[PDB]
């Protein structure tokens, strides 16, 4: 006897990855960038820049 | 092939933590993927040695 036409279903699950990277900033240079330790001199401005 | 892969990028975000004195900013990005074709859609040949 003939074969009836066949039907089939299939599913694929997701795959999960991630990416990352570090950005560590120094200990003497953010409060010139945060302006806390900034003192008013013609020398510290250049260092903040 | 023309489209051998389905790819989803999540949303970037920052997670930060203090160590090594300074600040340690840590970028992350969750991302997922899953093939988009019945049967194999990629192969290699190993040409040289």
């Amino acid at each position: 006897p003939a074969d009836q036409p066949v039907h089939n279903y299939m599913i694929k699950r997701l795959d999960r990855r991630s990416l990352n990277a570090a950005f560590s900033i120094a200990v003497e240079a953010l409060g010139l960038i945060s302006g806390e330790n900034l003192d008013g001199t013609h020398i510290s401005s250049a260092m903040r820049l | 092939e023309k489209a051998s892969e389905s790819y989803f990028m999540g949303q970037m975000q920052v997670a930060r933590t203090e160590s090594g004195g300074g600040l340690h900013l840590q970028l992350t990005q969750p991302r997922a993927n899953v093939d988009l074709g019945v049967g194999f859609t990629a192969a290699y040949a190993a040409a040289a040695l």
């Binding site: 120094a26 200990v27 240079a29 953010l30 409060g31 806390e36 | 300074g22 600040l23």
Partner: peptide, 23 residues
């Protein structure tokens, strides 16, 4: 009529720890 927007202020000063360590 007494509870948590100064008891607001009060609990969650919480999500501030760096106040960075870097100049």
């Amino acid at each position: 009529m007494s509870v948590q927007i100064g008891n607001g202020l009060l609990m969650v000063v919480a999500p501030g720890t760096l106040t960075v360590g870097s100049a």
